[PDB]
């Protein structure tokens, strides 16, 4: 229940995330836009910062989400270590120019950087993310605001992200008042309707992983793909909903939002300026195996985050593995890196010798994690790229057994027994086969926006704000079709929010 | 009738040759006739089938259907066309295995070797 103890913990967990977001957005402008840090160097510095901040205030407390920096195709999972930088090169050495940013660590111009992170205190957690964008510099200008706005489909994506974010914020604010809503009381039906029509206006589809949901203590949705739950009220937009919208558990009907509750928003929009046609938007995993295929568009990598399934137990033969398991289970149920578990990781002072100390510890931790993973104690949080499939291949396909195809050597089970589209009787395995079975291997760029809110009378928005996620000014088109019900409602909502009360937590200096 | 010593009228030898024919000979065995329009167009009665050829059925229960070939299963002595499938109630579709002697071609997939084959067999193109 929303006690003072609960909500001030939420606040002090949130604004740490806010100031760390400011730190990263600081550093990236320092590095690229200003007169050069790589992705994995940003990540552990951000986590060091967050823990150094956490120490001052406050027993279970730490990083829910390790800071993830997706670039231009990846829906989620990219957050590598310093161990893996040469490995990424000598794996992707023969591939082509795409994914050069994520491979090398140096970011390019026009590169759509989706940052995300989160922090938790006693199970009360706050996630946040922001799609920012790189654009080259002005040199003749004195102040050098960097030159050019964005124009294309990525601009579409950013616009849809921000607009969907503000609209759902306002909707969940009107959840307090059964009034101050255009009748054009609140339901996942309405939420999915307004966000889908925004996506359709901007020609940017919703990604399967996106959601809006309730939160409770220790139960946020940090994983959302591995661990299960019976009591989960919230909305998702996956391939089943895509096919249903083309036609015409997570129940959406018996769901009306109430006072005194904490919610997570997480929206992912994949742009369509090419593609030519109607088609599906699904996800494909990234493995470390160069040898499964010959094509150059594929990315080869190793995920850094893990999560451990405390239900299972197995004595290890290996001292290093058992010590690392001690270090793990003394942490919590949230995902983690190997760098988080170490002796010198927060970097009270920072030099090269401490990074070297961390690297040696990492060399031991990978050996421990080998045995901890060969037994099914810990699993990887997968790296997922958005990939497009036209309906032509799917409808012309041949699936000799539908609703019965497992994938049988997928290790997690829950991404195995999925059945994304029950109609047409195709499963994830045959969908992967069809996605690969075509020279229309079109991968989409994606934009991401994540916030945490709580309903008391005001909407207390524990993340976001204008300091945080002010958008990179851009130049998009398809800017919001008027002459419909829902668009009138959305504009009335945006005007009426200026009076509804939205409190917003500021970052820490 | 037969007027050569090279060749045999032996059922056993002929059946053995058919059933142990390699793929290079199964290509020419699995030949399809052309429609009257394509016959007037080119000046040729038949061709060996291939993958991207649009085709039409004229015999069997799946008659009057048409589509482009999705596979040529030389091992099974058949071809797999799309839009001809036995759909099970769950959602599964299996292709019907057709023989190209029944099929008739409506449109071809033309490249240099196929053009040369037609010019060789006496096609005005």
């Amino acid at each position: 229940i929303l006690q003072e103890s609960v909500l001030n913990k939420y606040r002090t967990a949130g604004q740490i995330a806010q100031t760390a977001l400011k730190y990263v957005t600081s550093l990236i402008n320092d590095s690229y836009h200003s007169k050069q840090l790589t992705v994995p160097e940003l990540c552990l510095l951000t986590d060091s910062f967050i823990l150094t901040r956490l120490e001052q205030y406050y027993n279970e407390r730490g990083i829910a989400i390790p800071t993830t920096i997706d670039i231009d195709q990846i829906s989620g999972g990219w957050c590598p270590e310093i161990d893996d930088t040469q490995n990424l090169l000598n794996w992707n050495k023969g591939k082509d120019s795409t994914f050069a940013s994520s491979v090398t660590g140096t970011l390019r111009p026009g590169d759509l950087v989706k940052i995300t992170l989160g922090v938790h205190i006693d199970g009360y957690t706050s996630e946040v993310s922001h799609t920012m964008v790189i654009y080259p510099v002005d040199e003749t200008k004195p102040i050098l605001q960097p030159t050019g706005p964005l124009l294309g489909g990525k601009a579409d994506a950013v616009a849809a992200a921000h607009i969907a974010m503000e609209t759902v914020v306002a909707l969940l604010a009107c959840a307090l008042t059964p009034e101050k809503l255009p009748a054009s009381g609140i339901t996942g039906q309405l939420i999915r309707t307004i966000v889908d029509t925004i996506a359709r206006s901007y020609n940017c589809g919703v990604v399967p992983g996106s959601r809006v949901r309730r939160i409770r203590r220790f139960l946020a949705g940090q994983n959302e793909g591995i661990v299960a739950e019976r009591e989960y009220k919230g909305v998702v937009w996956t391939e089943s909903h895509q096919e249903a919208d083309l036609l015409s558990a997570i129940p959406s009907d018996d769901f009306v939002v109430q006072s005194g509750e904490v919610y997570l928003i997480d929206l992912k929009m994949a742009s369509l300026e090419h593609c030519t046609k109607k088609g599906l938007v699904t996800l494909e995993t990234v493995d470390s195996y160069t040898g499964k295929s010959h094509k150059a568009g594929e990315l080869i990598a190793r995920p850094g985050a893990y999560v451990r399934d405390f239900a299972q137990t197995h004595i290890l033969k290996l001292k290093t593995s058992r010590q690392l398991l001690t270090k793990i289970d003394k942490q919590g149920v949230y995902p983690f890196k190997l760098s988080h578990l170490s002796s010198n990781f927060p970097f009270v002072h920072e030099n090269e010798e401490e990074l070297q100390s961390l690297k040696k510890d990492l060399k031991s931790f990978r050996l421990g994690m080998s045995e901890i993973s060969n037994n099914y104690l810990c699993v990887e949080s997968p790296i997922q790229i958005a990939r497009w499939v036209p309906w032509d291949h799917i409808l012309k396909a041949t699936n000799p057994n539908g609703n019965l195809s497992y994938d049988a050597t997928s290790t997690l089970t829950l991404p195995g027994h999925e059945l994304p589209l029950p109609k047409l009787g195709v499963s994830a395995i045959k969908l992967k086969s069809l996605m690969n079975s075509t020279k229309e291997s079109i991968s989409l760029p994606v934009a991401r926006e994540c916030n945490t809110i709580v309903l008391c009378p005001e909407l207390l928005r524990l993340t976001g704000g204008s300091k945080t996620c002010q958008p990179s000014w851009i130049h998009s088109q398809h800017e919001l079709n008027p002459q419909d019900s829902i668009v009138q409602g959305i504009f009335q909502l945006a005007t009426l929010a200026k009076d509804l009360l939205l409190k917003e937590t500021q970052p820490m200096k | 009738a037969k007027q050569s010593l090279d060749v045999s009228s032996d059922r056993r030898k002929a059946r053995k040759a058919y059933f142990t024919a390699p793929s290079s000979q199964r290509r020419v065995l699995l030949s399809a006739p052309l429609s009257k329009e394509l016959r007037a167009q080119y000046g040729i009665k038949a061709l060996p089938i291939r993958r991207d050829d649009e085709v039409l059925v004229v015999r069997g229960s799946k008659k009057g259907q048409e589509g482009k070939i999705s596979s040529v299963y030389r091992l099974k002595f058949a071809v797999q066309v799309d839009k001809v499938t036995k759909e099970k109630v769950n959602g599964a579709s299996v292709p019907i295995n057709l023989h190209p002697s029944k099929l008739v071609i409506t449109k071809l997939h033309l490249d240099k070797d196929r053009k040369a084959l037609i010019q060789r067999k006496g096609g005005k193109l």
Binding site: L246, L247, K277, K278, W391, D392, L395, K423, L424, G425 | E87, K88, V89, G91, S93
Partner: peptide, 16 residues
Amino acid sequence: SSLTLVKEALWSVIDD
């Protein structure tokens, strides 16, 4: 023959 009907409707929607 439900897959027949839903594929027919889906062809209808994607062709236009």
